[PDB]
Amino acid sequence: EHNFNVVINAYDTTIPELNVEGVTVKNIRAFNVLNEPETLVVKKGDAVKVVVENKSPISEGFSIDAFGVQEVIKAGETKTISFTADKAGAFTIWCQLHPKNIHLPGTLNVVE
Amino acid sequence: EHNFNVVINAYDTTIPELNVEGVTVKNIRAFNVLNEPETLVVKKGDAVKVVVENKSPISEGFSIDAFGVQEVIKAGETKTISFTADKAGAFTIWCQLHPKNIHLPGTLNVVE
Amino acid sequence: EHNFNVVINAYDTTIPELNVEGVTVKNIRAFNVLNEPETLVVKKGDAVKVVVENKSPISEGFSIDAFGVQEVIKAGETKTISFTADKAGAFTIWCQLHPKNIHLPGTLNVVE
Ligand SMILES: [Cu+2]
Ligand SMILES: [Cu+2]
Ligand SMILES: [Cu+2]
Protein backbone atom coordinates (compact mmCIF):
# COMPACT_ATOMS: atom_id res chain seq x y z
CA GLU A 1 0.00 0.00 0.00
CA HIS A 2 0.95 3.68 0.53
CA ASN A 3 0.41 4.85 -3.07
CA PHE A 4 -1.74 7.87 -3.87
CA ASN A 5 -4.33 7.69 -6.62
CA VAL A 6 -4.48 10.65 -8.92
CA VAL A 7 -6.96 10.54 -11.77
CA ILE A 8 -6.49 12.99 -14.61
CA ASN A 9 -9.86 13.95 -16.08
CA ALA A 10 -10.72 16.22 -18.98
CA TYR A 11 -13.80 18.43 -18.89
CA ASP A 12 -15.26 20.06 -21.96
CA THR A 13 -18.05 22.22 -20.61
CA THR A 14 -20.29 24.47 -22.67
CA ILE A 15 -23.52 25.84 -21.21
CA PRO A 16 -24.94 28.64 -23.40
CA GLU A 17 -27.71 29.29 -20.90
CA LEU A 18 -27.92 27.84 -17.41
CA ASN A 19 -31.34 27.95 -15.77
CA VAL A 20 -31.69 25.98 -12.54
CA GLU A 21 -33.35 26.62 -9.18
CA GLY A 22 -34.53 30.01 -10.41
CA VAL A 23 -30.97 31.03 -11.28
CA THR A 24 -29.77 31.87 -14.78
CA VAL A 25 -26.15 32.08 -15.92
CA LYS A 26 -25.21 32.71 -19.55
CA ASN A 27 -22.38 31.77 -21.91
CA ILE A 28 -20.56 29.31 -19.67
CA ARG A 29 -17.63 27.68 -21.43
CA ALA A 30 -14.71 26.03 -19.73
CA PHE A 31 -12.33 23.38 -20.96
CA ASN A 32 -10.02 21.95 -18.34
CA VAL A 33 -8.04 18.93 -17.33
CA LEU A 34 -7.92 18.29 -13.60
CA ASN A 35 -5.80 16.12 -11.37
CA GLU A 36 -8.10 14.49 -8.84
CA PRO A 37 -6.95 14.91 -6.17
CA GLU A 38 -4.79 17.96 -6.98
CA THR A 39 -2.99 18.03 -3.65
CA LEU A 40 -0.71 15.39 -2.17
CA VAL A 41 0.73 15.82 1.31
CA VAL A 42 3.62 13.70 2.53
CA LYS A 43 6.40 13.85 5.13
CA LYS A 44 10.00 14.63 4.24
CA GLY A 45 11.83 11.39 3.57
CA ASP A 46 8.62 9.61 2.61
CA ALA A 47 8.78 7.23 -0.33
CA VAL A 48 6.08 8.57 -2.62
CA LYS A 49 4.14 6.41 -5.02
CA VAL A 50 1.48 8.00 -7.19
CA VAL A 51 -0.70 5.82 -9.37
CA VAL A 52 -1.71 8.24 -12.09
CA GLU A 53 -4.70 7.17 -14.16
CA ASN A 54 -5.07 9.27 -17.26
CA LYS A 55 -8.74 9.48 -18.21
CA SER A 56 -8.05 12.36 -20.59
CA PRO A 57 -8.59 11.46 -24.27
CA ILE A 58 -4.99 12.48 -24.96
CA SER A 59 -1.54 12.18 -23.40
CA GLU A 60 -1.25 14.02 -20.10
CA GLY A 61 1.68 15.34 -18.15
CA PHE A 62 2.56 14.96 -14.49
CA SER A 63 5.59 16.93 -13.38
CA ILE A 64 7.12 17.86 -10.05
CA ASP A 65 10.37 19.68 -10.77
CA ALA A 66 11.84 19.49 -7.27
CA PHE A 67 12.05 15.71 -7.51
CA GLY A 68 12.85 15.27 -11.18
CA VAL A 69 9.37 14.03 -11.96
CA GLN A 70 8.37 14.72 -15.55
CA GLU A 71 6.08 12.05 -16.89
CA VAL A 72 3.68 11.74 -19.78
CA ILE A 73 0.82 9.31 -19.26
CA LYS A 74 -0.73 7.99 -22.46
CA ALA A 75 -4.46 8.54 -22.90
CA GLY A 76 -6.50 5.96 -21.02
CA GLU A 77 -3.38 4.52 -19.40
CA THR A 78 -2.02 4.30 -15.88
CA LYS A 79 1.50 5.13 -14.79
CA THR A 80 2.93 4.69 -11.32
CA ILE A 81 5.26 7.51 -10.37
CA SER A 82 7.66 6.93 -7.50
CA PHE A 83 10.20 9.21 -5.87
CA THR A 84 11.47 10.17 -2.44
CA ALA A 85 10.26 13.49 -1.05
CA ASP A 86 13.72 14.32 0.28
CA LYS A 87 13.02 18.06 0.39
CA ALA A 88 10.46 19.87 2.54
CA GLY A 89 8.25 22.50 0.96
CA ALA A 90 5.38 23.06 -1.45
CA PHE A 91 5.94 21.92 -5.00
CA THR A 92 3.74 22.45 -8.00
CA ILE A 93 2.31 19.33 -9.61
CA TRP A 94 1.81 20.39 -13.18
CA CYS A 95 1.25 19.25 -16.71
CA GLN A 96 4.17 20.21 -18.96
CA LEU A 97 2.07 19.45 -22.04
CA HIS A 98 -0.82 21.88 -21.70
CA PRO A 99 -1.44 25.46 -20.54
CA LYS A 100 -1.52 25.53 -16.75
CA ASN A 101 -4.84 27.36 -16.67
CA ILE A 102 -6.38 24.60 -18.80
CA HIS A 103 -4.80 21.63 -17.07
CA LEU A 104 -4.85 23.10 -13.58
CA PRO A 105 -1.78 22.55 -11.36
CA GLY A 106 -1.86 20.78 -8.03
CA THR A 107 0.58 20.71 -5.14
CA LEU A 108 2.89 18.20 -3.52
CA ASN A 109 3.38 19.29 0.07
CA VAL A 110 6.31 17.79 1.92
CA VAL A 111 6.05 18.61 5.61
CA GLU A 112 8.71 18.12 8.26
CA GLU B 1 -8.94 24.63 15.47
CA HIS B 2 -12.17 22.97 16.54
CA ASN B 3 -13.44 22.47 13.00
CA PHE B 4 -13.00 23.52 9.39
CA ASN B 5 -14.93 26.37 7.82
CA VAL B 6 -15.50 26.09 4.10
CA VAL B 7 -17.52 28.63 2.16
CA ILE B 8 -18.86 27.65 -1.25
CA ASN B 9 -18.97 30.75 -3.45
CA ALA B 10 -20.15 31.38 -6.98
CA TYR B 11 -18.23 33.75 -9.23
CA ASP B 12 -19.83 35.18 -12.35
CA THR B 13 -17.03 37.01 -14.15
CA THR B 14 -17.51 38.71 -17.49
CA ILE B 15 -14.85 41.12 -18.68
CA PRO B 16 -15.11 41.75 -22.45
CA GLU B 17 -12.04 43.96 -22.29
CA LEU B 18 -9.73 45.02 -19.49
CA ASN B 19 -6.64 47.21 -19.34
CA VAL B 20 -4.87 47.38 -15.99
CA GLU B 21 -1.52 49.10 -15.54
CA GLY B 22 -1.25 49.17 -19.33
CA VAL B 23 -1.87 45.44 -19.76
CA THR B 24 -4.94 44.45 -21.79
CA VAL B 25 -6.92 41.21 -21.78
CA LYS B 26 -10.04 40.50 -23.83
CA ASN B 27 -13.15 38.31 -23.79
CA ILE B 28 -12.82 36.99 -20.27
CA ARG B 29 -15.84 34.92 -19.34
CA ALA B 30 -15.58 32.57 -16.39
CA PHE B 31 -18.35 31.24 -14.18
CA ASN B 32 -17.21 29.07 -11.29
CA VAL B 33 -18.14 27.86 -7.86
CA LEU B 34 -15.23 27.49 -5.48
CA ASN B 35 -14.79 25.81 -2.12
CA GLU B 36 -12.89 28.21 0.11
CA PRO B 37 -10.63 26.85 1.28
CA GLU B 38 -10.31 24.01 -1.25
CA THR B 39 -7.81 21.95 0.70
CA LEU B 40 -8.29 20.38 4.12
CA VAL B 41 -5.40 18.63 5.82
CA VAL B 42 -5.97 16.42 8.84
CA LYS B 43 -4.20 13.59 10.64
CA LYS B 44 -5.25 9.96 10.31
CA GLY B 45 -7.81 9.24 13.02
CA ASP B 46 -8.99 12.83 13.37
CA ALA B 47 -12.71 13.40 13.91
CA VAL B 48 -13.15 15.87 11.06
CA LYS B 49 -15.81 18.56 11.26
CA VAL B 50 -16.36 20.71 8.18
CA VAL B 51 -18.78 23.60 8.54
CA VAL B 52 -19.80 24.20 4.94
CA GLU B 53 -21.67 27.41 4.23
CA ASN B 54 -23.23 27.49 0.78
CA LYS B 55 -23.15 31.06 -0.54
CA SER B 56 -23.80 29.80 -4.05
CA PRO B 57 -27.17 30.80 -5.59
CA ILE B 58 -28.08 27.13 -5.98
CA SER B 59 -27.83 23.84 -4.10
CA GLU B 60 -24.23 22.70 -3.82
CA GLY B 61 -22.54 19.37 -3.37
CA PHE B 62 -19.70 18.35 -1.10
CA SER B 63 -18.41 14.82 -1.55
CA ILE B 64 -15.42 12.85 -0.31
CA ASP B 65 -15.92 9.28 -1.50
CA ALA B 66 -13.29 7.64 0.69
CA PHE B 67 -15.29 8.57 3.77
CA GLY B 68 -18.79 8.22 2.39
CA VAL B 69 -19.26 11.97 2.48
CA GLN B 70 -21.94 13.10 0.03
CA GLU B 71 -23.84 16.21 1.02
CA VAL B 72 -26.13 18.68 -0.71
CA ILE B 73 -26.19 22.10 0.93
CA LYS B 74 -29.10 24.33 -0.04
CA ALA B 75 -28.30 27.86 -1.18
CA GLY B 76 -27.72 30.11 1.82
CA GLU B 77 -27.64 27.09 4.11
CA THR B 78 -24.80 25.96 6.35
CA LYS B 79 -24.25 22.29 7.05
CA THR B 80 -21.78 20.61 9.36
CA ILE B 81 -20.18 17.57 7.78
CA SER B 82 -18.62 15.14 10.22
CA PHE B 83 -16.60 12.02 9.55
CA THR B 84 -13.54 10.26 10.89
CA ALA B 85 -10.49 10.39 8.64
CA ASP B 86 -9.70 6.75 9.38
CA LYS B 87 -7.62 6.31 6.23
CA ALA B 88 -4.46 8.17 5.25
CA GLY B 89 -4.10 9.51 1.72
CA ALA B 90 -5.34 12.23 -0.62
CA PHE B 91 -9.03 12.37 -1.40
CA THR B 92 -10.81 14.63 -3.85
CA ILE B 93 -13.39 16.95 -2.35
CA TRP B 94 -15.89 17.44 -5.15
CA CYS B 95 -19.37 18.55 -6.04
CA GLN B 96 -21.50 15.64 -7.19
CA LEU B 97 -24.07 17.99 -8.71
CA HIS B 98 -22.08 20.08 -11.16
CA PRO B 99 -19.35 19.90 -13.83
CA LYS B 100 -16.03 19.57 -12.02
CA ASN B 101 -14.36 22.34 -14.02
CA ILE B 102 -17.14 24.79 -13.12
CA HIS B 103 -17.33 23.89 -9.43
CA LEU B 104 -13.63 23.17 -8.90
CA PRO B 105 -12.66 20.21 -6.69
CA GLY B 106 -10.48 20.42 -3.63
CA THR B 107 -8.62 17.84 -1.60
CA LEU B 108 -8.85 16.28 1.81
CA ASN B 109 -5.36 15.16 2.77
CA VAL B 110 -5.08 12.69 5.61
CA VAL B 111 -1.51 12.43 6.85
CA GLU B 112 -0.04 9.77 9.12
CA GLU C 1 16.09 30.21 4.65
CA HIS C 2 14.46 27.10 3.31
CA ASN C 3 11.17 28.89 3.10
CA PHE C 4 8.23 28.49 0.68
CA ASN C 5 8.51 29.43 -2.97
CA VAL C 6 5.45 30.62 -4.87
CA VAL C 7 5.40 32.02 -8.38
CA ILE C 8 2.38 33.94 -9.57
CA ASN C 9 1.89 33.32 -13.29
CA ALA C 10 -0.62 34.72 -15.74
CA TYR C 11 -2.06 32.65 -18.57
CA ASP C 12 -3.88 34.18 -21.52
CA THR C 13 -5.14 31.08 -23.32
CA THR C 14 -7.17 31.27 -26.51
CA ILE C 15 -7.59 28.19 -28.68
CA PRO C 16 -10.46 28.39 -31.19
CA GLU C 17 -9.51 25.02 -32.63
CA LEU C 18 -6.82 22.45 -32.16
CA ASN C 19 -6.58 18.76 -33.00
CA VAL C 20 -4.19 16.70 -30.86
CA GLU C 21 -3.92 12.90 -31.00
CA GLY C 22 -7.08 12.75 -33.10
CA VAL C 23 -8.98 14.80 -30.54
CA THR C 24 -10.33 18.19 -31.56
CA VAL C 25 -10.98 20.85 -28.94
CA LYS C 26 -12.73 24.09 -29.82
CA ASN C 27 -13.54 27.55 -28.52
CA ILE C 28 -11.15 27.47 -25.60
CA ARG C 29 -10.61 30.84 -23.96
CA ALA C 30 -9.30 31.15 -20.44
CA PHE C 31 -7.39 33.91 -18.76
CA ASN C 32 -6.15 33.12 -15.28
CA VAL C 33 -3.46 33.95 -12.82
CA LEU C 34 -2.24 31.10 -10.66
CA ASN C 35 -0.18 30.81 -7.51
CA GLU C 36 2.28 28.01 -8.17
CA PRO C 37 2.03 26.14 -5.91
CA GLU C 38 -1.43 27.01 -4.58
CA THR C 39 -1.18 24.99 -1.39
CA LEU C 40 1.11 25.56 1.55
CA VAL C 41 1.08 23.15 4.47
CA VAL C 42 2.71 24.02 7.78
CA LYS C 43 2.51 23.03 11.44
CA LYS C 44 0.73 25.22 13.97
CA GLY C 45 3.28 27.55 15.53
CA ASP C 46 6.10 27.50 12.99
CA ALA C 47 7.28 30.78 11.48
CA VAL C 48 6.11 30.83 7.89
CA LYS C 49 8.21 32.49 5.20
CA VAL C 50 6.74 32.66 1.69
CA VAL C 51 8.86 34.05 -1.12
CA VAL C 52 6.37 35.19 -3.73
CA GLU C 53 7.73 35.98 -7.17
CA ASN C 54 5.13 37.82 -9.22
CA LYS C 55 5.51 36.93 -12.90
CA SER C 56 2.11 38.40 -13.72
CA PRO C 57 2.20 41.48 -16.00
CA ILE C 58 0.45 43.49 -13.29
CA SER C 59 0.51 43.93 -9.52
CA GLU C 60 -0.76 40.85 -7.72
CA GLY C 61 -2.31 40.20 -4.35
CA PHE C 62 -1.54 37.52 -1.79
CA SER C 63 -3.82 37.42 1.24
CA ILE C 64 -4.55 35.06 4.11
CA ASP C 65 -7.12 36.68 6.40
CA ALA C 66 -6.61 34.46 9.46
CA PHE C 67 -3.04 35.70 9.86
CA GLY C 68 -3.51 39.28 8.72
CA VAL C 69 -1.53 38.56 5.58
CA GLN C 70 -2.22 40.90 2.69
CA GLU C 71 0.41 41.98 0.22
CA VAL C 72 0.54 43.54 -3.21
CA ILE C 73 3.52 42.38 -5.23
CA LYS C 74 4.35 44.61 -8.18
CA ALA C 75 4.78 42.97 -11.57
CA GLY C 76 8.14 41.25 -11.89
CA GLU C 77 8.86 41.81 -8.20
CA THR C 78 9.54 39.22 -5.51
CA LYS C 79 8.36 39.72 -1.94
CA THR C 80 8.90 37.59 1.13
CA ILE C 81 5.76 37.16 3.21
CA SER C 82 6.39 36.40 6.88
CA PHE C 83 3.90 35.35 9.52
CA THR C 84 3.35 32.83 12.29
CA ALA C 85 0.67 30.20 11.74
CA ASP C 86 -0.57 30.55 15.33
CA LYS C 87 -3.89 28.89 14.51
CA ALA C 88 -4.54 25.43 13.12
CA GLY C 89 -7.01 25.10 10.28
CA ALA C 90 -7.46 25.60 6.55
CA PHE C 91 -7.29 29.16 5.27
CA THR C 92 -7.85 30.51 1.80
CA ILE C 93 -4.86 32.11 0.11
CA TRP C 94 -6.38 34.66 -2.22
CA CYS C 95 -5.67 37.66 -4.39
CA GLN C 96 -7.48 40.68 -3.00
CA LEU C 97 -7.06 42.58 -6.28
CA HIS C 98 -8.68 40.29 -8.82
CA PRO C 99 -11.75 38.04 -9.26
CA LYS C 100 -11.45 34.76 -7.36
CA ASN C 101 -12.18 32.66 -10.43
CA ILE C 102 -9.61 34.50 -12.54
CA HIS C 103 -6.76 34.56 -10.04
CA LEU C 104 -7.51 31.19 -8.48
CA PRO C 105 -7.25 30.89 -4.67
CA GLY C 106 -5.03 28.45 -2.85
CA THR C 107 -4.90 27.18 0.70
CA LEU C 108 -2.68 27.54 3.71
CA ASN C 109 -3.13 24.47 5.87
CA VAL C 110 -1.92 24.70 9.44
CA VAL C 111 -1.77 21.22 10.93
CA GLU C 112 -2.01 20.86 14.70
CU1 LIG D 1 -2.37 18.22 -19.37
CU1 LIG E 1 -21.43 22.48 -7.34
CU1 LIG F 1 -4.53 38.60 -8.74
Side-chain angles (χ1 to χ4, degrees):
Chain A
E1 292 156 300
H2 99 89
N3 74 87
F4 284 102
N5 285 282
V6 175
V7 178
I8 303 180
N9 296 110
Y11 298 90
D12 194 333
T13 307
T14 299
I15 306 177
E17 179 175 359
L18 173 63
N19 186 186
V20 297
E21 299 185 2
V23 177
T24 58
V25 181
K26 53 189 290 294
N27 305 306
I28 298 177
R29 197 288 178 277
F31 181 87
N32 298 276
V33 174
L34 307 179
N35 276 24
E36 294 170 51
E38 297 186 329
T39 306
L40 303 184
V41 184
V42 301
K43 270 82 170 185
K44 184 176 183 179
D46 276 359
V48 184
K49 189 166 184 176
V50 190
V51 174
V52 182
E53 302 172 276
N54 184 191
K55 300 294 187 179
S56 170
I58 66 180
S59 294
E60 289 298 344
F62 188 90
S63 300
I64 307 180
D65 299 4
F67 306 102
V69 173
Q70 188 181 327
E71 303 292 345
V72 173
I73 303 81
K74 298 177 177 59
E77 295 198 1
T78 301
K79 195 162 191 178
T80 55
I81 302 177
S82 52
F83 60 99
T84 299
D86 66 320
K87 296 182 296 180
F91 313 95
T92 305
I93 294 175
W94 63 299
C95 173
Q96 69 271 28
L97 305 179
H98 315 117
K100 288 179 197 162
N101 72 324
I102 290 304
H103 185 156
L104 299 180
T107 306
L108 169 66
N109 288 285
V110 184
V111 301
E112 290 291 55
Chain B
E1 293 184 47
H2 36 131
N3 58 185
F4 289 105
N5 295 287
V6 174
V7 181
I8 297 179
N9 288 300
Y11 295 96
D12 196 332
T13 308
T14 303
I15 303 176
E17 183 169 356
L18 178 287
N19 184 324
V20 285
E21 309 175 7
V23 185
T24 300
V25 63
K26 295 182 177 57
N27 299 309
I28 292 182
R29 172 42 182 157
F31 176 78
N32 295 277
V33 166
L34 306 175
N35 275 32
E36 300 174 55
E38 280 180 352
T39 306
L40 305 181
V41 182
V42 304
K43 298 182 299 183
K44 182 185 175 182
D46 287 357
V48 186
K49 298 293 177 59
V50 189
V51 180
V52 179
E53 181 191 3
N54 185 194
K55 285 184 176 176
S56 169
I58 64 180
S59 298
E60 288 298 347
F62 188 95
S63 293
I64 306 183
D65 301 322
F67 304 101
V69 174
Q70 185 188 67
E71 303 289 350
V72 175
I73 305 78
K74 298 173 62 183
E77 175 182 62
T78 298
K79 174 136 59 182
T80 293
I81 297 174
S82 64
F83 62 97
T84 298
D86 57 7
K87 299 181 294 182
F91 315 95
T92 303
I93 296 179
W94 60 294
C95 174
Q96 75 281 185
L97 311 175
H98 313 121
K100 297 226 198 79
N101 71 324
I102 294 305
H103 184 159
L104 302 180
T107 309
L108 163 69
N109 290 284
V110 183
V111 298
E112 288 303 318
Chain C
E1 47 179 346
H2 274 299
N3 132 96
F4 277 120
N5 290 287
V6 177
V7 182
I8 298 182
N9 285 306
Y11 299 91
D12 196 344
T13 311
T14 305
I15 305 173
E17 190 173 320
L18 164 161
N19 176 317
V20 163
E21 268 189 70
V23 185
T24 300
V25 300
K26 303 175 189 295
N27 293 174
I28 294 176
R29 194 299 92 99
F31 177 81
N32 293 276
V33 167
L34 309 172
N35 275 29
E36 296 168 35
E38 303 185 324
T39 306
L40 305 181
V41 183
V42 302
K43 300 296 290 67
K44 179 182 178 182
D46 57 9
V48 183
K49 223 75 172 299
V50 185
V51 174
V52 183
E53 169 173 47
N54 182 191
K55 292 185 176 179
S56 172
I58 63 179
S59 289
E60 289 297 346
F62 186 96
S63 296
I64 308 180
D65 294 13
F67 304 101
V69 175
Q70 190 166 75
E71 302 287 358
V72 169
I73 308 79
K74 296 180 181 179
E77 300 300 300
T78 293
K79 181 176 295 184
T80 298
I81 314 309
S82 304
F83 65 99
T84 299
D86 67 316
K87 294 175 290 297
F91 316 92
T92 306
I93 295 180
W94 61 295
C95 171
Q96 76 277 187
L97 307 177
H98 315 122
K100 290 273 189 60
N101 69 325
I102 295 302
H103 184 159
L104 301 182
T107 305
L108 166 67
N109 288 286
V110 185
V111 178
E112 185 178 302

